[PDB]
Amino acid sequence: MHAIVVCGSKQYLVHENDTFFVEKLEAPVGKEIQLDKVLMLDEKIGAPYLEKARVVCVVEKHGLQRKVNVIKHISQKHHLKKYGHRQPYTKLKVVRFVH
Amino acid sequence: MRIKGGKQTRVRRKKWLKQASGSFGTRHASYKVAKQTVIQAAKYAYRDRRNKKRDFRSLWILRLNAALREQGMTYSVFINLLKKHNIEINRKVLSELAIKEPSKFNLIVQKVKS
Amino acid sequence: KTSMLTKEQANKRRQWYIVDAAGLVLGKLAVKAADLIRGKNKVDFTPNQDCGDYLIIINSDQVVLTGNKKENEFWYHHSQYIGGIKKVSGRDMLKKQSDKLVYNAVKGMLPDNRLSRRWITKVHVFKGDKHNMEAQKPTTLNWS
Amino acid sequence: AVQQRRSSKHRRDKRRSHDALTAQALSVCQKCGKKKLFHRVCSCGMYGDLRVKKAY
Amino acid sequence: TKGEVRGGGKKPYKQKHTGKARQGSTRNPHFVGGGIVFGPKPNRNYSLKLNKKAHTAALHTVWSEKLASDNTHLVDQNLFNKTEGKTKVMMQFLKSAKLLDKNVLFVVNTLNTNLEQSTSNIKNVQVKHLDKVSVRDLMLANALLVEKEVLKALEGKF
Amino acid sequence: MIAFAKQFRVRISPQKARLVCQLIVGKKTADAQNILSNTPKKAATLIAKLLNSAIANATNNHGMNGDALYVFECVANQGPSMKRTIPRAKGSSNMITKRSSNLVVKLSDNPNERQELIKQQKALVKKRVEGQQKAKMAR
RNA sequence: GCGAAACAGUACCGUGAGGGAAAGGUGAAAAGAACCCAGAGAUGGGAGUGAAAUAGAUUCUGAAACCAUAUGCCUACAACGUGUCAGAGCACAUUAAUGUGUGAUGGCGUGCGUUUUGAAGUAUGAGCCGGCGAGUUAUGAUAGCAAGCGUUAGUUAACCA
RNA sequence: UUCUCGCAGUCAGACAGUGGGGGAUAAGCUUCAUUGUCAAGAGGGGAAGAGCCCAGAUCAUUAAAUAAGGUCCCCAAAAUA
RNA sequence: UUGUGGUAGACGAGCGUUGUAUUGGAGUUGAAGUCAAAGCGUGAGCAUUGGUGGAUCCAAUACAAGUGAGAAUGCCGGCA
Ligand SMILES: [Mg+2]
Ligand SMILES: [Mg+2]
Ligand SMILES: [Zn+2]
């Protein structure tokens, strides 16, 4: 009914029909993707990893988070460097996970 | 030719002012103070973007130790029973969130007792 | 990004509690009272919503202080005037006002905060066994 | 003795919070219709039922 | 400049003991009366030099792209005549050859006066002598009508 | 249906007229003229006359109920100022400045008279967002 | 831009030599608001002319500092370089966006330029806003890059057309 | 890190360890030598500290393992003998 | 694969302004200037709609600079 999945370097706690945002996956919108890394699907602990168990997901959009306007200022010492950044995410929801 | 340059200065200070809203007093009115406040706010944001990932880890540690003390063992003993045997790569955010949906985390604490 | 962390909000549900300082020492009673008041033992501790239980103390004057602290360790308090340092000793404080002693030994261990002056009022230390807050139906537990 | 920092626009309003005004007690004169202020004579010439002045 | 505006040598203030800026003179560059400190001057040369051989090479090459770009229709001295001073017939010829929206250019040797009298009021067109045309005056045309003989003179000059 | 009334450059400070402007604002009409005529202040009569003028305006020109009127809005904006010099000790010549106020009054008829201004504000932002979403049809 | 677009060397200062400013724009054409109400009147509200009267003589455009008024949220046990990362509750709906407005509460948190070995500084400058305000030019020399012409090369100056 | 050429900036240094001169093995004193830091360096420890210890910050991440330093509560983490 | 802190400073790559020359274009069905908004870029910056305003302005390539403002107990004007 639940699951724990390792997307990117993060671990998520997903249930049926949950939209959770992960890093970029280079996948077109609508494709069924199988996040291979997994552990604790249902009362089953795969010690390093949970082998042969898969979770199937469909992605929803490729967006960009709110702008992080990072500016560093060495105080009173001639420095006003400026930079901007927009981390891209991929919003995807689960459909069904293989046992 | 002689150049006055009215639009550019107004646009620049307008952008700097707009970056700061909700500020107390004249900080949201005077550009000369608005720029300094924006600098300090961005410095604080840069510091807290690291502080928050430094701190949420401690928060998870606390809310995990509190749960573990109700089963008869401490957090420090727990990690060994994860690492040395019954090896797992379960993060501390989910080893903490799973308590919010219990009867499944107790499976974790009993599995390591083997 | 990742699963936004859960933090219970405005769902504070707290129960009263009873403990008798029969042979407790000051420090080990104070620490347990403080981290019970803070709600530190809760499985879901939201650090800004005051999820800590109430607490009533019984027989404060029966507390003990190890060693010779009763005649050597002084407690202090100052009014803003000059020479307002009111200095009292351990043995002197226990007979006259034991409740203030426990109150301060608990208030010191709480974080300098705004909830601190709201947590500290959730402790109701009594000198004798008889109290007036039995209307809340408090539970009882040993050495907390 | 001079201010060292600029007194802001907030402190000035806080000080002027008490500078508000108040209304004086008003009453309707008898034998004639007007709103004189209390315990005085109306412009109508009557203090209660008595002659104190000319028409106006 | 600061030294040319009608100003006062007097110091508007004293140097010290009156708390203001220094302000040695009234007509300083930062004042509102103003002596603009650097500005432009009317003695700037604005001129550049290009070597004669380089300029001849540029003229020759630009003639090379233009003369063989299927728009330099050869013209003759005959039709420079056969036209009155009227410019109506000129625009008639232009629309006949469909060159209304171009900038047609006439290079010539004898500088006939019937044509020069015409085409004067036509802003697009212009007639220039063989030695009066420059690189810009040629490559701007996008359409020109070289007349018959200047081909030999251009070959000689290369 | 505002039927307001204004006057330009009264010889009184805005801060000294706003004190009675606050006294009158929000009340009815009959209980306003007397309470304003009976105060001992310079700004009393200068606003009482303008209020009587506003009563006459709202009665004749716009033709409203009359007795249903009530002073809806009073303010005392900063009028143009006159900068004048003044002799001082040891010849320092500071500068006095004579303030002025552009007094206005507004007298509503219906009791609410506010959320419809917010309705016009929402109509403006509505037309802005509708014009924006219409411009998406560039395809 | 001449100091001076206008009744400028005027106003003004100085006994005198002398010093020496600021300031423009309704409208298409006054068609400059008859007449009514209030008010002593100025004036304001209607009406009328006008495409436009939020073009009305204060007369093109109208920003900020500053002052008022109001919709929504918060604030009277609170140690606050005023923000930031979290964070309810409350009210709404947008350049459809993991939305906006406010922010009870938690963690953290001693400005900006100067000159200094070292400044939050009990060093120094700025009350705020707006405008003006500081590496140019002439003629030379040196070096780099690129172009033209090239192995008895290259190249004009003044002047004339 | 050797040579040729273009363009610089610097000639007020401070502290810690170490070896000494002056000083009274007094000074956060003065002047050398040497290794480091700051100057021109953020972070963690040191309660708060430019000069001490572990270290060298391209940005984002609500991931993990460690260094100095620590594990009664503030303040994350420990027990056993 | 090696890296990517940085004052004095050395080098490179760019944005913006006003005008000029070539093409192209828009504009009383409303240009510029102005305000507002929950827009887009690594940054100088650049859009979109609505209100006001009523007549010039924008894009591409080069050239030319009286070309970029927080500080000078700066000047002037206005307001605290
Ligand atoms: Mg001071
Ligand atoms: Mg007062
Ligand atoms: Zn009467």
Side-chain angles (χ1 to χ4, degrees), chain A residues 1-6 8 10-99, chain B residues 1-90 92-114, chain C residues 3-144, chain D residues 1-33 35-53 55, chain E residues 1-68 70-83 85-154 156-157, chain F:
Chain A
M1 59 81 71
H2 71 76
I4 297 169
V5 172
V6 179
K10 333 296 207 309
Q11 297 182 356
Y12 295 80
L13 191 139
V14 304
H15 304 286
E16 182 65 26
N17 296 295
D18 291 331
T19 62
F20 62 112
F21 321 112
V22 302
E23 301 295 30
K24 192 152 63 65
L25 294 174
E26 321 295 8
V29 178
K31 188 165 80 76
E32 291 305 18
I33 193 66
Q34 275 156 34
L35 291 63
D36 63 328
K37 298 185 173 69
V38 67
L39 72 165
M40 170 76 38
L41 188 151
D42 291 330
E43 68 274 15
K44 295 178 179 66
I45 297 89
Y49 283 40
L50 196 42
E51 182 65 26
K52 184 261 183 182
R54 288 318 167 71
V55 56
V56 176
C57 295
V58 58
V59 307
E60 294 294 328
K61 74 173 306 201
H62 297 262
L64 300 172
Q65 283 195 51
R66 197 144 80 244
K67 180 177 285 290
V68 176
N69 223 333
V70 62
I71 63 172
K72 40 183 59 180
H73 185 273
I74 301 299
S75 186
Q76 304 152 58
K77 283 178 200 277
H78 312 285
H79 208 81
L80 183 62
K81 294 306 193 67
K82 185 179 298 187
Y83 181 88
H85 181 283
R86 271 191 90 112
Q87 193 64 282
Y89 65 95
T90 62
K91 153 167 194 308
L92 60 91
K93 67 190 294 304
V94 307
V95 290
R96 58 88 174 174
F97 42 72
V98 184
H99 277 104
Chain B
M1 181 55 188
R2 155 168 147 84
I3 296 89
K4 300 203 280 164
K7 176 88 166 178
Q8 310 320 310
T9 285
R10 197 66 33 64
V11 160
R12 195 172 60 85
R13 294 163 185 172
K14 199 44 150 62
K15 166 152 57 46
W16 274 100
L17 271 163
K18 182 193 297 324
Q19 283 214 250
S21 299
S23 83
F24 189 85
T26 197
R27 311 210 185 198
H28 67 260
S30 174
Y31 155 76
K32 295 223 285 195
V33 188
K35 189 163 76 173
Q36 293 161 185
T37 65
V38 165
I39 302 282
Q40 206 67 356
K43 270 194 209 175
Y44 283 170
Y46 179 76
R47 187 207 73 198
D48 299 317
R49 264 188 301 273
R50 281 137 185 82
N51 276 29
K52 95 189 173 175
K53 65 181 71 68
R54 161 176 309 160
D55 183 326
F56 268 122
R57 178 169 168 83
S58 169
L59 179 61
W60 302 326
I61 299 299
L62 185 40
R63 315 216 295 197
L64 176 55
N65 191 307
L68 294 198
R69 290 270 161 74
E70 311 315 345
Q71 314 270 288
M73 65 179 288
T74 73
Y75 168 61
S76 312
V77 175
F78 192 57
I79 296 315
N80 292 128
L81 302 184
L82 277 296
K83 183 164 318 194
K84 74 95 177 177
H85 203 7
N86 320 112
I87 62 171
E88 303 186 4
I89 322 293
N90 216 351
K92 296 181 190 293
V93 62
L94 261 53
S95 283
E96 189 276 331
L97 202 173
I99 297 89
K100 306 313 149 283
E101 295 68 58
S103 75
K104 193 66 59 66
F105 168 74
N106 63 7
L107 266 65
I108 317 304
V109 298
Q110 63 84 30
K111 167 58 142 60
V112 303
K113 314 277 205 168
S114 307
Chain C
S3 303
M4 183 176 177
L5 183 61
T6 61
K7 275 162 205 179
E8 51 76 20
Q9 62 83 29
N11 305 115
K12 76 202 167 274
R13 294 294 168 259
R14 315 157 287 197
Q15 287 69 240
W16 296 75
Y17 278 99
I18 292 296
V19 63
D20 180 3
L24 279 299
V25 301
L26 190 52
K28 284 150 199 318
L29 181 148
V31 292
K32 298 173 106 55
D35 63 358
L36 187 146
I37 282 289
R38 294 258 314 285
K40 184 64 75 67
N41 294 128
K42 297 300 194 223
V43 310
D44 62 357
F45 165 70
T46 304
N48 58 345
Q49 298 291 316
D50 186 4
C51 190
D53 291 331
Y54 297 131
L55 181 80
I56 309 172
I57 312 294
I58 298 296
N59 296 345
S60 66
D61 58 28
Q62 297 212 359
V63 73
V64 76
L65 286 83
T66 61
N68 211 32
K69 289 189 278 187
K70 268 153 56 64
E71 293 83 3
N72 267 16
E73 212 53 28
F74 296 130
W75 275 247
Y76 288 84
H77 187 298
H78 196 222
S79 66
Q80 309 298 308
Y81 297 73
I82 296 172
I85 289 296
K86 169 178 281 291
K87 166 173 73 169
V88 298
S89 66
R91 180 183 48 45
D92 183 339
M93 175 137 61
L94 286 186
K95 43 169 85 58
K96 292 316 297 306
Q97 66 273 7
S98 165
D99 61 357
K100 302 296 301 316
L101 187 153
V102 172
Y103 208 91
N104 286 43
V106 162
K107 181 168 75 71
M109 293 180 183
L110 304 184
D112 270 336
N113 186 280
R114 290 224 202 158
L115 271 72
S116 160
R117 63 207 80 165
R118 242 60 171 171
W119 277 320
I120 193 66
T121 189
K122 305 201 294 183
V123 188
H124 300 78
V125 62
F126 281 99
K127 200 180 291 272
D129 183 288
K130 188 268 171 194
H131 66 91
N132 50 57
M133 263 172 270
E134 69 275 16
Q136 285 87 345
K137 300 289 94 176
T139 60
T140 301
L141 74 167
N142 166 272
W143 292 353
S144 67
Chain D
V2 176
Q3 55 163 344
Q4 179 158 351
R5 300 294 332 294
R6 185 175 69 186
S7 67
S8 78
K9 72 173 59 37
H10 321 304
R11 201 174 303 287
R12 163 196 81 205
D13 293 342
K14 291 164 193 225
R15 174 199 304 125
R16 279 208 282 258
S17 67
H18 301 292
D19 282 26
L21 281 174
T22 175
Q24 278 86 330
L26 294 174
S27 177
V28 188
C29 47
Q30 305 81 66
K31 293 187 287 185
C32 54
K35 301 276 251 186
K36 77 180 178 63
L37 81 171
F38 201 47
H39 276 146
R40 322 292 205 270
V41 298
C42 56
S43 297
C44 302
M46 294 298 102
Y47 186 52
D49 291 331
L50 193 153
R51 203 71 211 161
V52 293
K53 270 172 68 180
Chain E
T1 63
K2 167 165 141 182
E4 314 189 355
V5 297
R6 171 178 256 124
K10 57 170 184 291
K11 297 185 49 65
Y13 314 150
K14 295 171 320 176
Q15 182 61 69
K16 266 161 87 66
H17 286 46
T18 71
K20 293 185 78 172
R22 288 199 168 105
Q23 314 303 19
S25 168
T26 294
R27 302 291 192 185
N28 277 31
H30 65 249
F31 275 80
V32 299
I36 281 284
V37 64
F38 272 96
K41 303 301 294 202
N43 62 39
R44 274 187 62 59
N45 58 348
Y46 273 80
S47 63
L48 273 76
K49 176 180 173 287
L50 184 47
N51 311 290
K52 282 179 182 176
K53 288 193 182 65
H55 173 279
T56 55
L59 195 56
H60 189 80
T61 187
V62 75
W63 269 107
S64 181
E65 293 84 4
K66 185 72 69 177
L67 177 140
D70 54 349
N71 273 318
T72 67
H73 303 146
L74 185 65
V75 68
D76 188 82
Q77 178 39 58
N78 198 328
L79 62 83
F80 287 1
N81 303 88
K82 211 195 289 182
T83 184
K86 265 65 193 164
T87 68
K88 164 163 52 48
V89 291
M90 181 66 28
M91 267 178 182
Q92 188 274 331
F93 164 80
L94 274 297
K95 71 178 184 293
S96 83
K98 287 151 295 315
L99 314 164
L100 285 178
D101 310 331
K102 301 188 178 184
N103 297 115
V104 303
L105 168 68
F106 297 76
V107 299
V108 70
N109 196 19
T110 62
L111 201 51
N112 185 307
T113 188
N114 289 318
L115 183 135
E116 202 295 330
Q117 170 169 342
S118 297
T119 65
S120 77
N121 197 42
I122 308 305
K123 192 176 319 174
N124 259 334
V125 311
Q126 41 193 330
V127 62
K128 280 210 151 160
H129 193 272
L130 161 65
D131 210 40
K132 298 291 181 68
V133 292
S134 72
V135 181
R136 182 178 191 277
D137 289 291
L138 189 152
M139 65 180 288
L140 183 151
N142 189 359
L144 56 82
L145 314 174
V146 160
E147 62 86 19
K148 172 60 174 65
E149 63 86 20
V150 308
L151 282 71
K152 273 68 70 184
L154 183 52
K157 185 168 57 60
Chain F
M1 61 79 71
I2 301 299
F4 55 100
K6 75 168 60 59
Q7 194 284 350
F8 184 92
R9 197 155 95 250
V10 298
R11 190 66 171 292
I12 191 167
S13 187
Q15 198 198 133
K16 275 189 268 156
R18 170 177 160 267
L19 293 176
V20 306
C21 182
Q22 274 166 3
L23 282 193
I24 190 167
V25 60
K27 285 190 175 304
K28 297 296 290 183
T29 184
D31 62 358
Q33 298 160 354
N34 45 12
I35 191 167
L36 192 56
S37 81
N38 288 317
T39 61
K41 288 272 190 170
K42 176 178 188 285
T45 182
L46 275 72
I47 297 169
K49 193 187 299 314
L50 179 85
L51 187 69
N52 289 1
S53 160
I55 301 299
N57 292 9
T59 289
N60 188 0
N61 303 328
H62 307 61
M64 311 196 268
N65 189 359
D67 193 0
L69 292 169
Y70 79 106
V71 62
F72 155 64
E73 182 65 26
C74 176
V75 289
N77 315 297
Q78 262 180 348
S81 297
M82 323 156 63
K83 314 296 289 299
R84 297 278 214 272
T85 184
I86 178 174
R88 303 284 293 167
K90 318 220 198 172
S92 48
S93 71
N94 312 334
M95 301 206 147
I96 308 314
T97 174
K98 309 276 176 65
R99 306 260 180 207
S100 313
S101 309
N102 312 118
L103 305 170
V104 311
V105 307
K106 304 193 177 308
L107 279 74
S108 159
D109 176 353
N110 64 344
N112 304 321
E113 192 46 13
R114 291 306 308 272
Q115 63 274 70
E116 87 289 10
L117 264 65
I118 323 298
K119 191 49 100 180
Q120 276 66 244
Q121 185 172 251
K122 289 185 175 67
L124 201 45
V125 301
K126 213 71 57 173
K127 83 181 291 185
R128 175 178 72 202
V129 307
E130 293 179 353
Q132 201 74 254
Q133 63 84 30
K134 183 209 302 308
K136 296 293 104 174
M137 312 311 141
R139 289 76 63 85

